[PDB]
Amino acid sequence: TKLEQIQQWTAQHHASMTYLSNPKTIEYLTGFGSDPIERVLALVVFPDQDPFIFAPALEVEVIKETGWQFPVIGYLDHENPWAMIADQVKQRHVNPEHVAIEKGQLQVARMEALAAQFSAPSFDLDITSFIEHM
């Protein structure tokens, strides 16, 4: 599957997780279509366990209606999405070291907000090209 291909890539690159933020990538993987938002929509993939989607609470319904077989975690407008994403990762027993992101799309401030929630991650991996070629 497309998701298993990403998981495999993640494992082959010795990444603790892949954080997908490009709405075009999320649409490609799920059918959930969207445009750039100020809020936080992400799809987190691990090398050796199930992925999850993190989204604004009101988008959860239409995301689950895609058939997506894995968790969808919502957040409310005044909650801290970065802390909540990190809590999901920490619940899954991951203390991330190398993290892959879509560097061509992800804004610096968002990478940093994510990184601040973890003890010593390394954002030295770019999945932009891999996603481009599938």
Automatic annotation (TrEMBL):
The keyword Manganese applies. GO terms for molecular function: aminopeptidase activity; metalloexopeptidase activity. The keyword Manganese applies. Keywords: Manganese. Residues 3-134 form the Creatinase N-terminal domain. Belongs to the peptidase M24B family. This is Mername-AA019 peptidase. Metallo peptidase. MEROPS family M24B. The chain holds residues 2 to 135 of 365 of the full protein.
